[PDB]
Amino acid sequence: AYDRAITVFSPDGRLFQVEYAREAVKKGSTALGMKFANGVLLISDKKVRSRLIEQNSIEKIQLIDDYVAAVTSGLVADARVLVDFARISAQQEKVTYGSLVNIENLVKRVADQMQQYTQYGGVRPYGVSLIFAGIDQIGPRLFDCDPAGTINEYKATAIGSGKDAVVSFLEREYKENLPEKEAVTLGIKALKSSLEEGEELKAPEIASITVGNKYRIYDQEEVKKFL
């Protein structure tokens, strides 16, 4: 009775429409982020559903600017809109103040846009989760953000179908302030732990950034080196 309209609380105080948007997220490809010594990285699995696709296009990891990037899971078209919103919102801040001092504030603006779409009749929530990772004046940052506009800051985290396994793995295996290669190797292990019945991990997307540098996206051969 209580799960048809976003503006309706259940008697236990739940918003089931927001909870159902979360279910769209759980169906997306696994992605993870982790902090390492002076840096942050993102890795993304890619559901591949045809060799006819240009796979190096409509990518899961998206640059927001040179120092900040996002990865998403859930409805793709919704994810695109949120990444466009984050980009325009990053530039507005830059124009206003000359720079983006704290990435948390960008993340909150995206999360507030999402929150809005859980409070007004005649709109549905975005069926999307995001990890943001980058460097600001505080240092390397890793956030996530869900369909409700709930945000958390992490040392390591994941989204998508393999979330639970990847987080499990990382919770046992994760160490702070690893060097880059070792952080990347840990991340691939974690990703691989979520695969099931001898399922092979094709070359994921990987991007990293360290303090004083801009983002780099690992090309095809650098990633296979870890496979």
Partner: protein, 203 residues
């Protein structure tokens, strides 16, 4: 103010001086008038400082966003066209500026843009109160067959001549060189001073 952009075979060189006046009153000796706005794109400013500084911030933000969206840098002509449209739109309440946009796409380019969004590409161009002095030097000494090293020397000569004759120009000369190989490079001021000494110049 004095600014200049020149094209060579595989390079753009852009330079300015730094004086900021209110009538005769030299308020600032080191304002900045030359900006990197993209990987292989530079912009010079002249005219009303507030208007020009807002345009610089916009162009930085928009070209970075365009690059992210398109996976390639905005072509230099497309930069000039963007500015042309933005400035003509507010024609009757204008940005009171003269801009040079220089860069490398498949070729080197320099565009001169006026306060009504008139935009013309040229082999070289100068803006500000000191520009007629610069056009004198360039008309007399510029060659398309110049090397980057001679091009750098020419613009220093041209802006130094303008500083001698234009009281609204002065201060240190900032120079940037843009190539496909090294990208946008602002030359170290010690290198500029050394060239100044060697050319036999003052201030």
């Amino acid at each position: 103010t004095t600014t200049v952009g020149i094209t060579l075979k595989d390079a753009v060189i852009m330079a300015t001086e730094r004086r900021v006046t209110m009538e005769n009153f030299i308020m600032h000796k080191n304002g900045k008038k030359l900006f990197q706005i993209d990987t292989y794109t530079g912009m010079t400013i002249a005219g009303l400082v507030g208007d020009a500084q807002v345009l610089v911030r916009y162009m930085k933000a928009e070209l970075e966003l365009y690059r992210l969206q398109r996976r390639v840098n905005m072509p230099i002509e497309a930069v000039a066209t963007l500015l042309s449209n933005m400035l003509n739109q507010v024609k009757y309440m204008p940005y009171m500026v003269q801009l040079l946009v220089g860069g490398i796409d498949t070729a080197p380019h320099v565009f001169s843009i006026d306060a009504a969004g008139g935009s013309v590409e040229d082999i070289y161009a100068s803006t500000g109160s000191g520009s007629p002095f610069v056009y004198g030097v360039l008309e007399s000494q510029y060659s398309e067959k110049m090397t980057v090293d001679e091009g750098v020397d020419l613009v220093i000569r041209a802006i130094s001549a303008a500083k001698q004759r234009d009281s609204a120009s002065g201060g240190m000369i900032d120079v940037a060189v843009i190539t496909r190989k090294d990208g946008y490079v602002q030359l170290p001021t010690d290198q500029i001073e050394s060239r100044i000494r060697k050319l036999g110049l003052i201030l």
